[PDB]
């Protein structure tokens, strides 16, 4: 185990190193405290949910019930320093009433409201527009089939009713994120009409007013997906236009863009025109592969672009990934800690001074300092943050994962549901 | 040379082949006549212009090549564009840059006057073409660390804002005189070579500066502005102030046009995807067809996946009437007049191939999720006789067929271009 | 229906337009009929095969769709391939996978026997086609953490090395019976989902394992091996043991064939660039034409920039005599028989367009740095009447012209596929 | 100014943090000492050289003379901890004789041999196959014009003679790197014949035997260049095949590959077959832009792939970038220090235990530990390495740059 006095010794020296270049490590840690990550429930059970029984990776101890998933999320959050949020999907409804996506009721989420209050977390929401017989040729809200459209519009309206109810009960705004798989596997003839059907369907979904204090909708675009490679009805351009036009949020999923595309470029082109962002941090490996978030160029750029340009007050940060080849609880902790330490590194910079140097076209100073900061003792500040919030330092949280494996995950498959 | 009887015989067979699948070849040719291409003047003289005799090319863009017979004067450039248009069937437009001002007066970019373009108004009337316009925001000492309108330096900003306002006054004047709306396209090099600390402030400086440029109202019948984003340029690789997102947002919110340059996007990015995401919200597009080869290289437009997708996406979804098609390339390694004709003809034959489809039936098949029929038919149409309809279009419009227009280039080299130096 | 008189008329005018620029359309069609395509059997039944009913499809590759009329028996798949080949002009080849073994004997991948392919030898002789072969290194419980031949587990290695050796023995036996060399294509899923620590040792394990597989000499007249690299697959995104560089190096050093699958490279990567960098050093290519849409998606091959560049690069530089052209794609969202015909006809018309160019003169123009003439002529040729020559080729070889073969597909749906 | 006792105290804590996970920080630093970077001379003077007077950026104080360039490289090396090498280009010949690229003599590099001895560094070499009237339609060695081919073959042979001589005089092998611009702006008809002309020409260049002890050739491919976008004669595949076939080195320039291409993937696909590598670390920003090397995914992957798989003894690491928008001396130090701290981070991992975990398919432990290691105190070990080798720590070397600007660079123009 790392010794707390080792952490304290390293922190005091780091504090002085950063003080010398005009950076306050105490203030940086206070800033990181105020950035909640919205931890996605579906990593815990491979997006099975509880509504439709049996609707990459095979690690033992998949969650199969609300209590198992709740326990798994509690365990992950206990190893993530600070205060965070959880994202639900509609299929994570908890009820003994037989339900379809178009018959869900707000009370079906009382279980998660009660859990969030106990855990001390806010809730965000996602309608479920996939893994259903009413998905017709990969289309839902914008299907050419009006019976398919009507079903999914009913689900869309219900997602808002649920989100409103949850926000009212928790006293914290629910971001209700819309992702639709709608598109074509192969080259379409008509690109226009599907997007006009989508526009009309979304306007119908958001028509009935609900208090902004309780909920607001965000719209998640995508470039391509498996079996839907050639055309995505809900493009990034369509949804940025839709969010600005209809005064809603825009969702940027870091895995959903072109090869070499830097999603950190988008923030400063959106905020002159739009309300707010839901930033889904996700690692794409050559496609929308939904790898666990790690400290890489994309995450460093996303986090430093939000910090440097002061956008955190208008950006809701969520995780989105699904890796079942590794301990599913550890996946959450890796991704959350990677996001936090990346935010903290960005906060541990003399940003005001670097901005003045850049305005003066002192590109020599900017390059030298940004490169030197990558090997400043940011780890010492991160370790101190972990310790101050009663979470294990460095390798030490593997001890907690191994204990959870012995006690829970390695036994669970043989346990009755 | 190709015998007109060969074109007529091939056309009569092609007409029947297309009629058999519910396609009217005569009607398709009538549709192609209604699509003017805006031919860019700067391919003729390697973007030298007339304002600054020996100014070096800056702003993340480069011209490679050394072919004989570069245009050096207004008369030479005008003659070269006349020769290119004589080999491009139908009626088209020409794009000017501000540096193509024709005056005996000492001008800078902030002292240009509308009458400095009387030469081009007179030429356009005699040629029977419309004019589009581009402010020149590059190759100038007042470009400071690759920035212009959005420079943090108020002196630099003010100079370039004055040029922007003048571009609108010039464009309005040309539009009034020609009785045809002048699209005034704005392209700025503004950005950073290396990674910026502040991405927000440059884009707020750009927003405020553009609003100042467009503040004074001018009749839409004479001119409307379009805004051209870029991902990266040479010496400006890491950040572009005027991004595609920024300008799509700007155009929609300020009721202006959005410029899509096919060379200015990510690897594998399909700009034909953008039209149907734009038109539920926005007014119109200026499409700059340009061939990127692994960077914004401004290669001559050829019949490739990008051009085919651009053209068929505009035809299939009925966007031609809200989309101005402009050319943008500069290849100096080849006959500069031939460069124009290759790119223009590539664009036209690609539009025509898209028009020669049973689009209403293909749309119904797709609505019924008949993806088998869609794949079979779209693939068969790629080897239908679209060339026979293209040749007939060329012949009907008094332009050479196939390889024949090379004879015209060789004669123009002999009589004009090769005599110049 | 297309009137044969329309085809004949269009062809006579096309023949003259091409003759005017020094191109012989009759000679172009003779050249095309000498290029066989190896039609992959696995498009017919969504790569189910016959060895293991209902085994889940694994190995970084997926099939989307549920169009009616899937083949479920050897006889159904054989009939479906017969129907596709009947609509593709000229004479071609078929690729088998090991899992397409036909036997009432209990078999695993390490106990397959050459005689388990007698069914396909008989079919190939009756159909009049050559056969190529692929070992099946996926969709099996012995695939351990996405690794087979180069697994760190010796038991897994030994199982897959036995399958590798058997693929060669089966291929040798087919080649002997058919009197036509079997290209035996090796594709392994081996790799990691996430970032590896050790990139060296897996590739040394692969090198050793492949050397063991090919150790026992077999007659070159009967079979030769080809090795197929990949950049990434689903669930194996971060590292592929058998990289393109590994296999080009391996093919050259061991005097085997290199397999280029057009779907298996980087964004913007032009696989037609590789031929002229390989042939100064290496023996032969197996070119797997496949359409990737933003991943190794195995879309049906269409006439696009990639296919046009592949076919014209092989034609212009005279590499066809050393290049085996195979199809690889699986699209179950459409008529599976139609999928074959679309991809095969796209490939043939693209080869033919490449052959319909004054290549000798264009090369001289290029040698003289006449880039103006090269650009004008290559662009004009894209709208020459290549379709008239293609139509003449289809008609001369007793296949429907243009949209007409849709009638055959609709008749086959009504009479066969929709009855299953 | 960072206090040495601040560095020593941070180091002692880091040493213990690393010891706890089976990593020896003293040994990691000894391994870093053994990895020389070949610093490219041409960043100092914007690739002008001295052979042909004036044939992105305009920062003041460009080197214009051998003495100026030599002094600039001395300053950069004084701020890069440990012992390194310098790469020359043929156009950096120092002679009062009238020379062309096909008439250079080994003695024309006596200036640089003498400088390298004084500085205590080895020299690598690059033939200059660009910026010359004999470049015909962007082709040199593989031009269809036999007069052009013969001119560039003479230069190629002379590059080997110069390299052998430098190698003999310094007692250190000269890696003689060959980069040719040869290719086409637009789509070629014949891709085969240019590459056969290249094969025949390279074989003529390397025909005359020279001792590997003094010099070995390396071959640098490229995907595309400005004005040469559509076809490159010397492709990566061509040169990997050529290097393996002819028993020479293969040059991997990190800036010269496809979008998303990870050049760290190539090493373990090459070394079962080939002799050695020349690794040109370079930052591409959406093209072969030759940005200064920084600590990014590419550099982290290149350096950890070399140290994890033990390829450093067969891999020569060179810098290749040109940024004239910043202090040119600072450009070298940023790139070199980025490379060194990235190598050091890779060396500060429990590589044997991680290999064991991965062999055992423990992908959970591998993800957790590799991610934790990114925020271990690698900076404390880097700062100790800098201080132990008499170079400034962190921001402090900016003082040295500012002083060199006042005293030298800002006095030139
Ligand atoms: O990115 C998404 C779809 O690819 C979605 O936001 C979530 O991952 C989805 O709701 C669950 O897979
Ligand atoms: O695309 C552009 C620059 O990249 C511009 O529209 C034109 O190229 C410029 O106005 C002239 O080069
Ligand atoms: O490309 C391949 C896998 O990615 C293989 O050649 C074939 O697709 C496989 O053998 C059948 O899926
Ligand atoms: O990569 C290169 C050219 O793009 C070369 O190695 C060097 O940059 C050249 O020798 C000097 O510019
Ligand atoms: O993991 C230990 C052994 O168990 C197995 O037999 C099955 O996992 C492996 O192949 C090893 O030999
Ligand atoms: O290690 C001492 C130096 O000696 C060498 O010059 C080799 O002779 C290396 O380049 C080092 O820089
Ligand atoms: Mn998402
Ligand atoms: Mn995703
Ligand atoms: Mn443009
Ligand atoms: Mn461009
Ligand atoms: Mn394949
Ligand atoms: Mn594939
Ligand atoms: Mn290099
Ligand atoms: Mn480079």
Residue numbers in the entry:
A (entry chain D): 1 to 55, 64 to 425
B (entry chain B): 1 to 421
C (entry chain A): 1 to 420
D (entry chain C): 1 to 55, 64 to 421
Question: What did the study's authors say about this model?
Answer:
L-RhI is one of the enzymes involved in L-rhamnose metabolism and catalyzes the reversible isomerization between L-rhamnose and L-rhamnulose. Herein, we report the crystal structures of L. rhamnosus Probio-M9 L-RhI (LrL-RhI) in complexes with L-rhamnose, D-allulose, and D-allose, which show enzyme activity toward L-rhamnose, D-allulose, and D-allose in acidic conditions, though the activity toward D-allose was low. All structures belong to the orthorhombic space group P212121 with four molecules (Mol-A, Mol-B, Mol-C, and Mol-D) forming a homotetramer in an asymmetric unit. The overall structure of LrL-RhI is similar to the known structures of L-RhIs.
In the complex with D-allulose, D-allulofuranose and ring-opened D-allulose were observed in the catalytic site. The bound D-allulose shows a ring-opened structure. The catalytic metal likely moves between two positions (Mn2A and Mn2B) and is refined as alternative metals Mn2A and Mn2B with 0.8 and 0.2 occupancies, respectively, considering the electron density maps and b-factors. The catalytic metal at the position of Mn2B can be coordinated by His264 and Asp296, two water molecules (W4 and W6), and O1 and O2 of D-allulose. O1 and O5 of D-allulose are recognized by Lys230 and His97, respectively, and Trp187 faces the hydrophobic side of D-allulose. In addition, Leu57 and Ile61 on the flexible loop region cover the active site and create a hydrophobic environment along with Phe138, Ile47, and Phe330 orienting to D-allulose. In the structure of LrL-RhI/D-allulose, an alternative conformation of D-allulose was found, α-D-allulofuranose (before ring-opening, yellow stick model) and ring-opened D-allulose (yellow line model). His97 recognizes O4 of α-D-allulofuranose instead of O5 of D-allulose. In this study, the flexible loop region of LrL-RhI was observed in the LrL-RhI/D-allulose complex; however, the corresponding regions in most of the LrL-RhI structures are also missing, suggesting that these regions are highly flexible.
